[PDB]
Design a protein around this nucleic acid. Sequence first.
RNA 1: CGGAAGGGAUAACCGCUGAAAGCAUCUAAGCGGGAAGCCCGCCCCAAGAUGAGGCCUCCCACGGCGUCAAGCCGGUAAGGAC
RNA 2: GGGGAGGUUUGGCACCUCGAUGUCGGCUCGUCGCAUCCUGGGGCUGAAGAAGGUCCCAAGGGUUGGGCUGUUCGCCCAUUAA
RNA 3: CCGAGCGCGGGAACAACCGAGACCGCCAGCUAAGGCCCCCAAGUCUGGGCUAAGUGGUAAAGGAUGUGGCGCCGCGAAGACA
Lengths: 167, 205, 37, 138
Amino acid sequence: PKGVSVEVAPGRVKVKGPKGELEVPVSPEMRVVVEEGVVRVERPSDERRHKSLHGLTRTLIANAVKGVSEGYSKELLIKGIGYRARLVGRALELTVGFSHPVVVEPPEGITFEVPEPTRVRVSGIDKQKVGQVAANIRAIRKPSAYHEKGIYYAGEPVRLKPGKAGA
Amino acid sequence: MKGILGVKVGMTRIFRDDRAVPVTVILAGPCPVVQRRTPEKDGYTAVQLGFLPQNPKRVNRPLKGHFAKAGVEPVRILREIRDFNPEGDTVTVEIFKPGERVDVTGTSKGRGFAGVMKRWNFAGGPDSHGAHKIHRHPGSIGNRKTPGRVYKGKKMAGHYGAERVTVMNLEVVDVIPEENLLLVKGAVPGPNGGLVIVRETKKAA
Amino acid sequence: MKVRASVKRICDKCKVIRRHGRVYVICENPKHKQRQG
Amino acid sequence: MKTYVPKQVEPRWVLIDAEGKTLGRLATKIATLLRGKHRPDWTPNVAMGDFVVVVNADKIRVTGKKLEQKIYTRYSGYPGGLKKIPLEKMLATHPERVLEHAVKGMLPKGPLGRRLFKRLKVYAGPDHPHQAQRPEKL
RNA sequence: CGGAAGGGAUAACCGCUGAAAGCAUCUAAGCGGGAAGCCCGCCCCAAGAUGAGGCCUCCCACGGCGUCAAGCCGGUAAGGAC
RNA sequence: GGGGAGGUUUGGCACCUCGAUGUCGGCUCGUCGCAUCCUGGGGCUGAAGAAGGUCCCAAGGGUUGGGCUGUUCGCCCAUUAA
RNA sequence: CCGAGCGCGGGAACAACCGAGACCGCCAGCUAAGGCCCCCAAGUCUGGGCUAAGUGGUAAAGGAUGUGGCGCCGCGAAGACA
């Protein structure tokens, strides 16, 4: 962790790096402290709920460090027809077969980025905004439905038989 | 979030557009501002408006003739419009061009004791066949020995009429500020000669 | 088959979790979609 | 002999916190003081058990899941008129009413237990009207 | 003319991060979405809310008995009544 | 083939009321349940789409008018979001 | 046992369930059942072990990666489990 500058506190930890600032509120049931470079996660005992907490924690500040060290990739893709992915404005303006286009703002910690209106990437220093926002877009437009159409993260287009199934 | 006092005038039918309009007209009257209300000292936001100036000897005592601005009293007291705050002036109608639907709050005509038939609208029975006894009776109430009682607020043989009624949303047809008229789509509670206030409504956002 | 008083793992793809306080049956296949109902 | 009877002694005023305290055991003591039951000068039919002003009851603690799951019910006489509002929303809007009504179910009910519930002043602050003494407790 | 619009947490259900359990998982701490339902926002009663609230102005200090401590009484002031 | 739930069916028992508990249907006023008839949210599909199928969630509102029978019920009539 | 002990304490209430055979008086102590935060009188007594659902605060077969201790049975530094 070279581009880091951490900050321990009771509940949360207040972490800084080259990108933006980030904070992970950790359940204070073990205490983490900036040691050398990489931090240590030392539970005050050995119980179930504890094990959960310590592991969780570890991943929390883990995502915290790699985040400020630039880790923003929120890839997305559309496999429909005229389903375009225009980036006009700061907003993401898409037309996914619905009777009208769709307008997405880039809120805090996040920009978008459309390499081409056929596939859409989103910039963000936060693991929540990744999954959640990209989800919200794929929830703008459902995938496949038997055949193939819509929005997908980058997954598999499992199908349901065509000219049949309709008795 | 606006308002002004008034009184019930007509109900007619002005051939506006090419459509006839049942039109209540309301003499809004020059109702002067007086003792204001703030939430620091009262606990809300309102303005006091007296209606029509007719007050000399037979008024007596305090007056907001005191207030700081006077005007003595109307002839029939003043009322408070919530969410209101003008700009140090007296107000009549001009604050509403046509196209601005408003709720109209007024008293209602009184029907004294109302029969259940002409109150909650019941049948009464048959125009013969059975017994002439009931004929116009409120039928029966609750079940036998359980409930065991009667319902608090059961539609019953009681009073109806002398009540406060606020009607909602009516196109302000036009405003006559040269006098004191405010004509809107016909409705308005009470007699063709009783107090009635105007308040801006709630529709869009 | 959601909502049945018995719920299970049918093939070697169907695995049970706990969610909201009710027992849930998962499996990538949604035709096996079961819940403690 | 003939057991003794206290005159009109002085209604001692008191002060307790609120925060960090269980809903339960809190009122428990509180209440039991409205009755002169802490005092060696207790008499059943006379009501000389002190005043209880409380401060910051906005931040009372409670165990359980309570917070949400704890429902309070009010019945207005008109049928279908059983209202229930969780402790959850009783905190957000007028939170005193959860300390009040609690003691209110920890005294007797004879007319005085009422007059005595009056002998208690809840606030969710702290702050109050510094009337007199109110020397803190624990 | 009214239902509404719109605000807040939610039901079934669908999503994010995420350990316990190197994997995975809506969950155990953490979030987001989401019902004609739920608390509202509209309509009305309403301080006998004995807890009896608040706003604004209007009113004279024993008058003759109660000497202390609460009051009693025959007439006034703002008013109110018949 | 098993185990329950509910207490509206047909009933077992004979405890209150034999110095009286006016036993069927219709009318008027209703209300409470949810195991939902419609409306609203949805999962599963032998769900392309439309329509349907079953199961979850959910009482807020709504739950028409005539023929035949004392009729409750039920068949038909024209409608229905129902 | 109630009946004839609807006389007393418990069991919230409560003919027969627990305690218990009531000459009178006593502003005297022990104790039964049942209790000892409070309504209500007395331990928010000491110590160890559990449960996280209002379970406690009233149901089953039957289903489950709920939780915590016990017992067994193969796999692994020659390198297993994922």
